[PDB]
Amino acid sequence: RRYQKDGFDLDLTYVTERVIAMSFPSSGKQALYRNPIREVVRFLDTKHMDHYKVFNLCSEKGYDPKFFHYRVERVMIDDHNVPSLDDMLRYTACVRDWMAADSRNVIAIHSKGGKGRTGTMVCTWLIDSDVETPSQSRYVGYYEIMKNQYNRQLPPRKSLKIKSIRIHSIAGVGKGNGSDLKLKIIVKHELVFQCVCAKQHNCTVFPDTGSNAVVISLQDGPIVTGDVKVMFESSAGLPKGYEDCPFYFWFNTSFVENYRLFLSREELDNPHKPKTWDIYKEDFGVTLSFTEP
Amino acid sequence: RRYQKDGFDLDLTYVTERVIAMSFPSSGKQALYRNPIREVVRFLDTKHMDHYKVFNLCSEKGYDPKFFHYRVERVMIDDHNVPSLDDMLRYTACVRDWMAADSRNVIAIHSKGGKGRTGTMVCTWLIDSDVETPSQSRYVGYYEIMKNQYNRQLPPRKSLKIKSIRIHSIAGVGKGNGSDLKLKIIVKHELVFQCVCAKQHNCTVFPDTGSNAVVISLQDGPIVTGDVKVMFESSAGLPKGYEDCPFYFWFNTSFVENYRLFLSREELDNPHKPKTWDIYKEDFGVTLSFTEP
């Protein structure tokens, strides 16, 4: 819903009377099909003068603080990826402080790509005051659990150790045995664990054809703390989608209950898209088994 | 000095046997004249396999941690601007830890623009182990002072308030009175103070034509702490250079001695370039007057 009022042609989305969403305001030979930085600057200067903050939720692009009168905060969110809960808490904290300055402070939120990052961090603010991928949905769920239970603060810090990964309904995906997935565990932009199933060196494969599980014994698993990314790379032509991976996870280990995490086919970032509902059947899922150090 | 060895055409600079400087590795429709991300990844994978870390000193653009096998740290340095001393200490600690991890570990350093930020942050490591604008030079000097006196730590935290700004040898620059400069004080991407001399509202102008001084009473100046940037905006057609401003500063308030900071014509970001040595004469300068709260 482009903002076509008052002679404007920006890709804005006036989500709430005090919260504005838009796309990345670009400069140079990129204003033809995207927002021009100066035009949107003028738009939000003639509407709210010295009463806006521009949240640039881009870990990959930034323009200058000076354009928006040096009121710009950058949240390092990767495309199709979630922010850390510390990032979400700091985000909502600075937003609440901004709205406490006076009654007519608005906020502009954008990201370079689609309304995944801006959607996530506008819905997060929406439910704090009251998305594309299911990782963002589950992170909004994490933030609501924090908001209503562990009041606007970090959960009880749990350091968990992952011990095995169970894959449900593997008949159809992969070569046929499940020994093609590649594991990558990322914590704070750091690859803390990787393994390849075909070589079977850092992990072992124990396929049980009775229940269609190819549970992989994940020896000496990392003691993950905080937000974790687990992507599954494959070498058998799986339908790679977002961020060039068959499917990836994003979760906070402080929210895991009873040291078990199962992600249904629908959560499972990338299989959730309906266009690939033929290699991942309805019962497809990945179960993560945890341990307490 | 581009790296033409081993069939490569990269814009590298092998500064030391274990430190590498290069330009930003770009992707998309930019590899025609800039560094291709995949090509540089291949170069530093076949040269240093799993024994390097790439430092991205760009506050305006980043690509993805995944390309360099999730060994990438971003330092938020603005173009034609200096890093914070906390950032410099964190970077130097990171480099020291990386080199202590193994005897083969290398570092790759780049920035999007010219070799100002990469030059700054490579000379900082060069002086710790053993530059475009002069503020980067003064910050390398700040780091050498910290390294050799207040050993590799911050100096005694000093917070001071600017009481007035003295402009030396103004006969020729500006309208002829000095009532065209505009002040902008930026601390941690925050416009903490601004003023316009022509209106004479936030500051008062006291032109002392006897000594060619237009010292401006900076009433109720900010209580600055840490790293401060001071840009001088003008509306009399000054030869705007870097950052689109007549001249700006970048100074740490902890390093001020005797509560005074005079900036000679040579330091004075933008007057430093000899092409403008006709409106800023040899005695041009700015003096920062401080007061202890």
Numbering used by the authors:
A (entry chain A), B (entry chain B): 192 to 321, 349 to 511
Original paper wording:
Compared to Ci-VSP, Danio rerio VSP (Dr-VSP) with the active site cysteine mutated to serine (C302S) showed better protein expression and stability. We therefore incorporated Dr-VSP (C302S) into nanodiscs for the study with cryo-EM. One class of particles yielded a structure of the cytoplasmic domain in a dimeric form at a resolution of 3.0 Å. This structure resembled prior X-ray crystal structures of the isolated Ci-VSP cytoplasmic domain15, with the E350 gate (E411 in Ci-VSP) occluding access to the active site. The dimeric interface in Dr-VSP buries 744.5 Å2 of surface area and involves 21 residues from each monomer, among which 4 hydrogen bonds (E251/G253, G253/E251, Y261/E461, and E461/Y261) and 5 hydrophobic interactions were observed. A similar, albeit smaller, interface is observed in Ci-VSP crystal structures. While diffuse density was observed in the expected position of the nanodisc and TM region, these features were not well resolved in the final map, suggesting flexible attachment in the resting/inactive state. Cryo-EM on Dr-VSP yielded both a high-resolution dimer of the cytoplasmic domain and a low-resolution monomer structure in a nanodisc, which provide structural evidence that a full-length VSP can exist in both monomer and dimer forms. The high-resolution dimer structure reveals residues and interactions that are involved in the dimer formation of the cytoplasmic domain.
Voltage-sensing phosphatases (VSPs) dephosphorylate phosphoinositide (PIP) signaling lipids in response to membrane depolarization. VSPs possess an S4-containing voltage sensor domain (VSD), resembling that of voltage-gated cation channels, and a lipid phosphatase domain (PD). Membrane depolarization drives a rearrangement of S4 that turns on catalytic activity in the PD to dephosphorylate PIPs in the inner leaflet of the membrane. To identify additional coupling determinants, we performed cryogenic electron microscopy (cryo-EM) on the Danio rerio VSP (Dr-VSP) and obtained two structures: a low-resolution monomer structure in a nanodisc and a high-resolution PD dimer structure.
